[PDB]
Design a protein around this nucleic acid. Sequence first.
RNA 1: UUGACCUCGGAUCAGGUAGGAAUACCCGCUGAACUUAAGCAUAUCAAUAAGCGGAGGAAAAGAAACCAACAGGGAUUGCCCUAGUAACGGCGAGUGAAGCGGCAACAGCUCAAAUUUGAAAUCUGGCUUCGGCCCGAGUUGUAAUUUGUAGAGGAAGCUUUUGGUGAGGCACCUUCUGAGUCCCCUGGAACGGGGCGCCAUAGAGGGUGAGAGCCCCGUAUAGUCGGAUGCCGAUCCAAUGUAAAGCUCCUUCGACGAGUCGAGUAGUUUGGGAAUGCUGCUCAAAAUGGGAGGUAAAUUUCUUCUAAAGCUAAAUACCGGCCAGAGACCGAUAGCGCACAAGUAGAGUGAUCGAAAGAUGAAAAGCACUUUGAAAAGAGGGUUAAAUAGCACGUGAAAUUGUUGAAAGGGAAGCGUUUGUGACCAGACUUGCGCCGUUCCGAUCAUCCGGUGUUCUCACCGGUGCACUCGGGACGGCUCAGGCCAG
RNA 2: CGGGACCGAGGUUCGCGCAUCUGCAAGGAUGCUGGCGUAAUGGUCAUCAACGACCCGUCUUGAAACACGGACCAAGGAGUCAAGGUUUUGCGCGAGUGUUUGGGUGUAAAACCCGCACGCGUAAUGAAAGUGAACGUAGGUGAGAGCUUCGGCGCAUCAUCGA
RNA 3: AGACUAAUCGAACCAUCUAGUAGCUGGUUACCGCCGAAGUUUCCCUCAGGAUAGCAGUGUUGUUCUUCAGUUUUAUGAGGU
RNA 4: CGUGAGCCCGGGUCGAACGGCCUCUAGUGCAGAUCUUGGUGGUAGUAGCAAAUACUUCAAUGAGAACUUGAAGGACCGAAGUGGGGAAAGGUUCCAUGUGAACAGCGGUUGGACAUGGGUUAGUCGAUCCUAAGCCAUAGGGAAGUUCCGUUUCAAAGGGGC
RNA 5: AAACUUUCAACAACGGAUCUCUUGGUUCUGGCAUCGAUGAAGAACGCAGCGAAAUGCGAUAGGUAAUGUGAAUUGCAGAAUUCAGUGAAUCAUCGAAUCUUUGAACGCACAUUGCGCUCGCCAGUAUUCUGGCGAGCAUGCCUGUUCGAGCGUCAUUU
Lengths: 213, 121, 258
Amino acid sequence: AIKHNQQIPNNHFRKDWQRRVRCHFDQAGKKASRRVARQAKAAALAPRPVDKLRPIVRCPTIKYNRRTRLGRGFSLAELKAAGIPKLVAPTIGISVDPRRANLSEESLAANVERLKAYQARLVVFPRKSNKPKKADTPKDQQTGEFVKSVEAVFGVERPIASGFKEIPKSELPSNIEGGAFRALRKARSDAKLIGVREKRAKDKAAAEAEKSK
Amino acid sequence: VKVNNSVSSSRRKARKAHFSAPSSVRRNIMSAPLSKELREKYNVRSIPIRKDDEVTIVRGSNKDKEGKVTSVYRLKYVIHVERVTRDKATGASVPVGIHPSNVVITKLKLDKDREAILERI
Amino acid sequence: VSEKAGHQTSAESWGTGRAVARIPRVSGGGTHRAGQAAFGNMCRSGRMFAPTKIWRKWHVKVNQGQKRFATASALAASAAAPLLMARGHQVSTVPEVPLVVDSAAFSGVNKTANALALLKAVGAGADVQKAKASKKLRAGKGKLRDRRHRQRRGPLVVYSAETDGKDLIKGFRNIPGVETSPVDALNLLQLAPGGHLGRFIVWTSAAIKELDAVYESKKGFQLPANVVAQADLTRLINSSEIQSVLRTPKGDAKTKRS
RNA sequence: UUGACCUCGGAUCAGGUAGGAAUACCCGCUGAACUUAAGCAUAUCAAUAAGCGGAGGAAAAGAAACCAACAGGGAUUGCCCUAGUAACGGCGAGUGAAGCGGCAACAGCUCAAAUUUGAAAUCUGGCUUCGGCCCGAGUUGUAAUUUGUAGAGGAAGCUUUUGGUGAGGCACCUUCUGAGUCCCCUGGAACGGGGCGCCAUAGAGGGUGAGAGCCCCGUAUAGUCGGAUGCCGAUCCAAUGUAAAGCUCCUUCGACGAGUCGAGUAGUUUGGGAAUGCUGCUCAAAAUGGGAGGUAAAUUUCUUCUAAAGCUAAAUACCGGCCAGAGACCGAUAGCGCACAAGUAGAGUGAUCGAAAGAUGAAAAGCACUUUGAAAAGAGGGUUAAAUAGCACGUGAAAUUGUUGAAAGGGAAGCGUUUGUGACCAGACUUGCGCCGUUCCGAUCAUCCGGUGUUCUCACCGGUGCACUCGGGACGGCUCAGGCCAG
RNA sequence: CGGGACCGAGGUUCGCGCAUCUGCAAGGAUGCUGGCGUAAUGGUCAUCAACGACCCGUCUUGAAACACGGACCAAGGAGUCAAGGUUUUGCGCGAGUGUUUGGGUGUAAAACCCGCACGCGUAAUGAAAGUGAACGUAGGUGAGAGCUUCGGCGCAUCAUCGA
RNA sequence: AGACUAAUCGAACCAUCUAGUAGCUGGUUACCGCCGAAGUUUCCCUCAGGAUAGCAGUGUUGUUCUUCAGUUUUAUGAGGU
RNA sequence: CGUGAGCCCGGGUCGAACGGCCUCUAGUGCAGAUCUUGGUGGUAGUAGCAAAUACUUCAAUGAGAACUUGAAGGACCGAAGUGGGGAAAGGUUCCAUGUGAACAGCGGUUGGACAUGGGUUAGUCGAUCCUAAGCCAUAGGGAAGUUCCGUUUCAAAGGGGC
RNA sequence: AAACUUUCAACAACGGAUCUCUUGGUUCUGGCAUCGAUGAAGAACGCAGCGAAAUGCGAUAGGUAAUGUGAAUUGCAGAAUUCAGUGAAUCAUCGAAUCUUUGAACGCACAUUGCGCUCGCCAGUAUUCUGGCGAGCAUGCCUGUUCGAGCGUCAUUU
Ligand SMILES: [Mg+2]
Ligand SMILES: [Mg+2]
Ligand SMILES: [Mg+2]
Ligand SMILES: [Mg+2]
Ligand SMILES: [Mg+2]
Ligand SMILES: [Mg+2]
Ligand SMILES: [Mg+2]
Ligand SMILES: [Mg+2]
Ligand SMILES: [Mg+2]
Ligand SMILES: [Mg+2]
Ligand SMILES: [Mg+2]
Ligand SMILES: [Mg+2]
Ligand SMILES: [Mg+2]
Ligand SMILES: [Mg+2]
Ligand SMILES: [Mg+2]
Ligand SMILES: [Mg+2]
Ligand SMILES: [Mg+2]
Ligand SMILES: [Mg+2]
Ligand SMILES: [Mg+2]
Ligand SMILES: [Mg+2]
Ligand SMILES: [Mg+2]
Ligand SMILES: [Mg+2]
Ligand SMILES: [Mg+2]
Ligand SMILES: [Mg+2]
Ligand SMILES: [Mg+2]
Ligand SMILES: [Mg+2]
Ligand SMILES: [Mg+2]
Ligand SMILES: [Mg+2]
Ligand SMILES: [Mg+2]
Ligand SMILES: [Mg+2]
Ligand SMILES: [Mg+2]
Ligand SMILES: [Mg+2]
Ligand SMILES: [Mg+2]
Ligand SMILES: [Mg+2]
Ligand SMILES: [Mg+2]
Ligand SMILES: [Mg+2]
Ligand SMILES: [Mg+2]
Ligand SMILES: [Mg+2]
Ligand SMILES: [Mg+2]
Ligand SMILES: [Mg+2]
Ligand SMILES: [Mg+2]
Ligand SMILES: [Mg+2]
Ligand SMILES: [Mg+2]
Ligand SMILES: [Mg+2]
Ligand SMILES: [Mg+2]
Ligand SMILES: [Mg+2]
Ligand SMILES: [Mg+2]
Ligand SMILES: [Mg+2]
Ligand SMILES: [Mg+2]
Ligand SMILES: [Mg+2]
Ligand SMILES: [Mg+2]
Ligand SMILES: [Mg+2]
């Protein structure tokens, strides 16, 4: 029933949609109840922070790898380097992720210093105040000026590396010899023809040359 | 205003609770002020009317008569006062209903349950 | 309306050949509802035309920036004496329109007796008394649902939530028409009620200090420029610059008949 | 002959459990057509309605045989976006996800596969309950260790463990906490109008004989009269190491789920296209093996996980059940079918179908008594503010009808333009402004404060006043204007 | 130069003219007189009279139709809402724009504040691999509102030859 | 006999899918002001309907020494009634 | 008053709320749809109240008597009846006393109507017992399942004495 | 001229519109998670001083016990000793009970208030018959108990 210079419609409304219409009139009511739940959790968890410490991870695609975010938990390699037992970290507010693996020393080193920074500022009360143990924070070190949420203080600080660097003209980097455009064109051609060159190396004539001494 | 999410300010619900109140609830609703002499003696503003209290009518066409209460008739939310009556066609006298808020209690029937009530307030 | 309304029946049309309209009719034979029409907006117990849904756009998304532009305009309009009078406030005894009361006077206004006395002293008594004496009973079915009365709007007290404190609002509730607002909120529904500019505002001294900080904390919003710099057309037209280039009036206000 | 074991039975044997209801939301199976394609058969409607089975306060899913191809993310769920996109489709009509990213929430674990083998260390049941004992289960494997993040065996070092006592601060209900019935008028009755007051952390709401903050219940802040239970910690005081837990180390090992994986074929399903999932049948594996890496196949590499066993709260859905609070909603032909003895009366053999129906008055004060009548009732009389509210009851429209009054009528009436006649009636008009003639009060001007557009004016005060000023009424004269119809 | 009819709009002077020491018939009616001052004029209704007047809605080339619906009255009764587009109007910001998925806060479903990502736009063209917008005052010619130091400059937009 | 199967039979009755679809019939609710048509072209399983162009309204804009014309004259062609 | 939709005022009834102006909002305007629901007309005091042969006199009751009652006369059903009983079905219609309205398509003092009471007695009648056509369990076998088949089968099936 | 027909007004009718209201509906939001073989949901029949329905309840029947409140219920007499009451009420709370016949419905049936069987007590001369009262008797499945079956099978006697 098209009548004029219209855009061809794409309205997927032919499947008795009126039975499955979800209207969010409780958006304000849900928000208030979520805050009530958060307040109750904080009161029960006091003086512990309401959340857990998480590592910095790099986003997993070429579109987002320029930026870092918070991960699920610290890998076992990071925990072992920091000097924290795997089954002790969950009891002191550290998130553990046995699935994650470290393929670079840089990311491992960045997360280890974060673990050591948190460990420095962490106060652990004794399991029974009468007799403190070796690993319990002494009574004098406890002060009472604590923090509410870890992720506020231990969030990402520079998710994307800055691009406002300024250098002296003496330190000006040199140019690519053949031209940066030609460098990209040559790189593309090498990947496109990697199999053709290897096939002919290794050529039937080259094999014939190998065969014919 | 009203700030209590457990209390309604609905006209429809307010009237339903008033006209469907059980006998015990209707007792509290049917209360009258005390006189100045009783107010200063007991430090109480108002209490529910008992059967044998003596009141004085303040409002209506009987607004100066007084006498002993003879019936606290909770179903119609009215009080029957002695000698405050009205004549039928046949000439027989029937009592007229007086709302408790239209009278003032000039004399209480003191009993150890009422005496306890006065101490609580 | 309920989605089942008008459709809780099994009526079917009788068709032609029976000297009745072709509309669906109830079945059975033992009730008044024997052969009565059932479905349709014209029937007695049918359904309404296009039954109302809860999908309707109840809420409106207004751009943040037009809200702030209007709130600034409402505050600016609150600083003009003609706009206060044209609204209907009794400001005949107010010294200056931006009525700013020293915040030290609000020390003991947590009691309604003191708060009312303070408004009378500063010159807001006439507006306060007007609101109290205007309580009427509204006309219509509004009384049935919840809305029983209408009682006019009085002065709006604006304070600072961190310096003045939160005890000010306690003494200003039972006063009819008088309402409070922290300097960092400034609801537009209270600054131009009904869409009419010129609310009578009673500021505290502390709230005036913070008004500049409030509008400099708002990120992404600068105080707007105006399409006209000098908003007074009398001086613009009667200026020596303008009148010197006019090539004399070619006629008069009232023309002689031909 | 007797005693075992295996398998199969009896018993109103001892002790237990299941069914049905409910099903709004949830987990499955089964499963249409109307409709769209302007016909119609694939398609679509729709992996929907109907049907069947099974739970809970949520359910389900869930700790990768994942996503990716990156500098790599890291259980599940939900929202926003991806995206009306990749893709599917008589490539027509149409349908149509997922990775990444931001956020809400956050939590991890238990088995099989090992000889406790110097000691079945395990468990139901009965008795005793006083410690234990006695049958039985079980070696065709119950306890302890181990679950791939590992682990086991080493030998050095470091390190870990239990009971108590409760403030109160929540969560439960429960008693208590402000101010006029002051004067006058209208009214049947003030809750109305006018005046004089008071409370307010309380001017939400309702009732009371009409619009009540102060007549009554409640409403706003805490804090007190109490008591039921179980959750949490802040101070303090008790102890102790059997043989149990970790951490660093490298050598040695390092069991890891089969009619399953996978392949073919058929059906169905999917965006999944040489086949996304599921199911039936046939074939049917392996140990650095296997799966996946979105185009079928052979060859060679690479990346990521470890299927065929299991449990687990939150964010999420839902107004069906229970309880609350609200509305720019409806207002008795509306809103649910039901504001009422409504799933009722009633209809149908039955499955089922299914209404209509609110309002006297503030208070029954619901009409005593007399008289006519067989009686229903009528007429007097009385109640009420009102019967022009009499239970056939708030107000009481129209259609339709009766009486009275006013008109007209030779096979319609109604209607438009225009008069006449008759009945009824609204306006306008009644005088007003000026000048000159009587009787009573303060004007010109100046001083002295105070305001102001800087020269105007208000406050007190000298204005002193009968044909002289100013103002006002009394009675006369003249001019002007003034309604309707006309020459 | 006579006889008659209908009309009097406008509301201080200004003007066009004519006459002459006056003024006027010249940019629209004044003067005098009379009756009544109320149902007398006027209005409504009823009625008679003159002239005229087919029953509405609808489909249709054509309806008063021997085309259909309509006995009468009251109440109810039919272009609504959502998502997605497009053009136009108003508004804010403007190479940016959009707070409200969510978080903080609150007089508590309101109002106020916050920020990362993301959507649209800023770059297109190919089936794709991919490539990716200045010879020049971002060009020349003609027209062009407006401005002009009067010799010229020339926005938007259109036509044309180019890059 | 397409007969009978609860006054129902060339496929009973009940509830639901379901407000099934309908290029076809009927209806579609105040006033005034201004402008004001078409039944024609092309395509269609098209002929009681659509899309398309035409006719119309509204909103504008470039402008407002804006330009042209259902017309005549002069000059000069075509036609085959 | 307005060209008009409409607005305003006076008079009568009535008894508790309502209006103007500026914006916002919509379940917002009726003459029709063989429209829906309710109510009311002309027709119209009209069609009609005509099958089953049929009634009359006196008296009582009563406000009132063609259709109440008693007596007398005249008739009909004419034993495959307009009689005396029952099965199914109905459910108090049975009986007495009393009666305003409504019902008995005319009346009504009468009634299967209305109101208040009363009324159904079993070892011997019937049900109960038996089996018929047939239906349903059990053992089993199908089916995703609601359930279908099976009634003696491919079952360790029961009944009595001291 | 009247009658009749038509029009209007007043009054009176018929009818229930309009106005105003509202212990009702509807939608949204917030909180909670609790049926049943220890017999559920539903059904039938009964129970009040005077009740047909509604509501409530079950032969302990418009209800009992217990707790709290504190003087009623109401259409009439009936409670006035219940007035210090050691306690009214169609009150509120509710932790103890009662709970007819049924119904998943469970001895077998049921269109029957039908037909049975076991134990105990009481009465009739009664271990057997009759009557009254009480407690019982479904199916599937699980663990155990005890009684068995099978040349399935082991050892010994024999
Ligand atoms: Mg007919
Ligand atoms: Mg089709
Ligand atoms: Mg079609
Ligand atoms: Mg078809
Ligand atoms: Mg279903
Ligand atoms: Mg679960
Ligand atoms: Mg997009
Ligand atoms: Mg699909
Ligand atoms: Mg296939
Ligand atoms: Mg299928
Ligand atoms: Mg397939
Ligand atoms: Mg699970
Ligand atoms: Mg009256
Ligand atoms: Mg009345
Ligand atoms: Mg009436
Ligand atoms: Mg009438
Ligand atoms: Mg004739
Ligand atoms: Mg006339
Ligand atoms: Mg002439
Ligand atoms: Mg006249
Ligand atoms: Mg006249
Ligand atoms: Mg005429
Ligand atoms: Mg004619
Ligand atoms: Mg019409
Ligand atoms: Mg024709
Ligand atoms: Mg004809
Ligand atoms: Mg027709
Ligand atoms: Mg007709
Ligand atoms: Mg945002
Ligand atoms: Mg952006
Ligand atoms: Mg150009
Ligand atoms: Mg035939
Ligand atoms: Mg038949
Ligand atoms: Mg239909
Ligand atoms: Mg074709
Ligand atoms: Mg046609
Ligand atoms: Mg067109
Ligand atoms: Mg030719
Ligand atoms: Mg009233
Ligand atoms: Mg409508
Ligand atoms: Mg209407
Ligand atoms: Mg109508
Ligand atoms: Mg009709
Ligand atoms: Mg006749
Ligand atoms: Mg006949
Ligand atoms: Mg015979
Ligand atoms: Mg017989
Ligand atoms: Mg009889
Ligand atoms: Mg009769
Ligand atoms: Mg009669
Ligand atoms: Mg069977
Ligand atoms: Mg006429």
